[PDB]
Every structure is written in C-alpha cells, then in structure tokens.
Amino acid sequence: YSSLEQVTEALARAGLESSNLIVGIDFTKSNEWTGARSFNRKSLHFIGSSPNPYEQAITIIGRTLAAFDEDNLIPCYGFGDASTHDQDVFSFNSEDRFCNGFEEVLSRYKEIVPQLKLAGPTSFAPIIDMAMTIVEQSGGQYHVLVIIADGQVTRSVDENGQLSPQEQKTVDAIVQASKLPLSIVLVGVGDGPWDMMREFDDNIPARAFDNFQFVNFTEIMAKNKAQSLKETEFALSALMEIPQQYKATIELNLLGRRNGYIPERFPLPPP
C-alpha cells in the first residue's frame, strides 16, 4: 500500500467497526541508550523538532485508527518511570481524563517527558490490567491496546526454564485479557534486543483467541525504501490481524457483554 488511508480502508473492508484506542508508553531508563543504533545515539524520549520513535509510532497508528472512533478518546498512560516502576501506570491527564485524539496524546507526551525520572524494571502487566478495566467499564466495547516499549519484559536471572516475576505477571495478564473484547499490540522501538520475542509469544498459554501481537518498529523503519511505504508496512504489520480478532470477539460473545470479575485498576496521577 502507498498510504495509511489504504490501510485504514483495508481494516474497514476486513470488518473493523467501532474501535477504541488505548496507548501505554514505556518510560524505562534504558531509553537513554536504546537509541544507540536506531535513533543516532539519542534518547528514544528525546524531544527535538523531529519526531522520536515513540512520537512516530503514536502518529502512524493514531492516524490509521482515527476512522473507527467518532470522538477519538484515547486513554493514555505511562509506566516504567520512577512513580510506577513495574507495579503501576500513570495517567497523562489529571483524574484520568482521556486524551483528545492522538494529537493530544502527542502534545501531552512532550509536556510530560522532561518531568519524569525514567526508571524500571519492565512489565506490561500493569498497562494490560489498566486496559482491561477500561474495556470493562466501557461495557465490553472493542478496544485496541497499543503498547510502545524499548525492551522485552525484565528477566533478572533463573536459563532453567522459569519465568521472572515480571514475565509471569505479564503472561498472566495477556491470557486473562483474552476474556475481554480487547486486542493487545506491543510495538518495539529502539535497538532492543527483540530477538527472544516471538519465542516469548511461544510460551503464552492457550487462549480462546490470539489477543496478542508483537511488531518491530525499528526493524521496519530501517529498510531501504520511501518513508511512506515504511509507514504503511508498520501500520499494516501492527494492525492487519485486528479485524480478525474483532470478529473473534463477536463469535465468543465478549463484545457488549461485561465480564464481572475484572478488578478495578487505578492510575497514578501524572508526575
């Protein structure tokens, strides 16, 4: 495809209807160096006059999905900074006020970044748990959770086939989320590594439907072709499987139904 528009129309013809976007941003301290090869020895969270990789990912995906929400309200969270670590997420806005389209996700982000202290370690359990509450409170409406991160879930130290506590909770959160009408997209930005990644998806337990997808933003953005086509490939690789998961949610009677056993997660305020 040559534009995001062709991608947008491709989701639409594949059966995609109303879809609410949720964004979670990685604020781990590794973002200082993971831009070594991929972002010219700059911090991934560097704010200049060019968009950094988080800003690019947000822009491309927010644009491709803008058509599927009338109000474009995007619940927007950070995690991995000093206030949250691997335990919580924080709202971009006070009182967990959702963002107005990706453009307010973008502007609000740049305001927030230089007021953080990047921390760690890395778990996606809190952001996934957060998106589950939002889905449940929405009354079972279809959501796409897009997680944008610069590394895989923290594994401190135990080859002999055991899971780190972060891995365990993340994998638990992914499986548990398959009970809801929700698609989870992990976007990998920066140098990574992202090698051990679809061997990770190999150890996610069986689910009613395949609610999880990893996409490597860096890898795509590195190929030798027009900026447009890189952007199209990323949008498509990120989202090509979401219509099929949306249908899955219908055939399992998840949509429009409330689950009843989803604990209410609360977001820390923006720092």
**Which of 18, 13, 8, 3 shows the shortest CA–CA distance to 256?**
18
Q: Which is nearer to Mg ion, 79 or 236 (CB)?
A: 79
Contact map string, positions 96 to 135, toward Mg ion, x by CB under 5 A: ----------------------------------------
Instruction: Using CB atoms within 10 Å of the CB of residue 209, give its burial: 0 to 12 exposed, 13 to 18 middle, 19+ buried.
Output: middle
Contact map string, positions 147 to 186, toward Mg ion, x by CB under 5 A: ---xx-----------------------------------
Binding segment toward Mg ion, per CB under 5 A, in 62-70, 93-101, 194-202, 209-217: 62-70
Q: Which is nearer to Mg ion, 86 or 233 (CB)?
A: 86
Q: Per rule CB under 5 A, is residue 69 in the interface with Mg ion? A: yes
Bridge-based pairing of strands 76-79 and 90-91 is: antiparallel
Query: How far, in Å, CA of 126 to CA of 22, rounded?
Result: 13
Q: Which is nearer to Mg ion, 8 or 30 (CB)?
A: 30
Q: Which of 41, 48, 49, 71 binds Mg ion (CB under 5 A)?
A: 71
Query: How far, in Å, CA of 20 to CA of 180, rounded?
Result: 14
**Which of 121, 123, 242, 131 shows the shortest CA–CA distance to 171?**
123
Report yes or no: 15 and 246 within 8 Å, Cβ to Cβ.
yes
Q: Which is nearer to Mg ion, 28 or 249 (CB)?
A: 28
Instruction: Using CB atoms within 10 Å of the CB of residue 206, give its burial: 0 to 12 exposed, 13 to 18 middle, 19+ buried.
Output: exposed
Q: Which is nearer to Mg ion, 75 or 151 (CB)?
A: 151
Report in angstroms how near the CB of residue 190 gets to Mg ion at its nearest: 8
Report yes or no: 198 and 214 within 8 Å, Cβ to Cβ.
yes
Contact map string, positions 7 to 46, toward Mg ion, x by CB under 5 A: ---------------------x-x----------------
Q: List contacts with Mg ion (CB under 5 A).
A: 28, 30, 69, 71, 150-151
